[PDB]
């Protein structure tokens, strides 16, 4: 069973080419990347204050 990647074609419809043109000239996906990184900004980071909180272990 094989499931290969990267086999599409650019659809020459007006909708698809104006969506790719908006992607190019309007920086949309870069704003999407910034949105993902700020979505991890407003979380709470999983650090431990070390010399007071030692890490977990196994027996």
């Amino acid at each position: 069973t094989y499931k290969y990647v990267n086999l599409r074609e650019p659809s020459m419809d007006m909708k698809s080419v104006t969506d790719r043109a908006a992607q190019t000239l309007l920086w949309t996906e870069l704003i999407r990347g910034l949105g993902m990184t700020l979505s991890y900004l407003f979380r709470e980071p999983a650090t431990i204050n070390y010399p007071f909180e030692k890490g977990p272990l196994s027996p």
Partner: protein, 68 residues
């Protein structure tokens, strides 16, 4: 008795599939948004520049009438 680690009655399902929201906005309408904001700014810009030309001609009249 026997006390290993089995699956307890069979576990629930596990997701693995890809997902993208494809949002979106139907980008031709987003061009319309950009051109609308652009022309909005040009309209207000035109109005403020012509009113400031009026006041600048008033300052011209000030320097003219004060001069002799």
């Amino acid at each position: 008795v026997k006390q290993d680690m089995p699956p307890v009655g069979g576990y629930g399902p596990i997701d693995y599939k890809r997902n993208l929201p494809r949002r979106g906005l139907s980008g031709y309408s987003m061009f319309a948004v950009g051109i609308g904001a652009l022309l909005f700014g040009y309209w207000s810009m035109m109005r403020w520049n012509r009113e400031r030309r009026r006041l600048q001609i008033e300052d011209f009249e000030a320097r003219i009438a004060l001069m002799p």
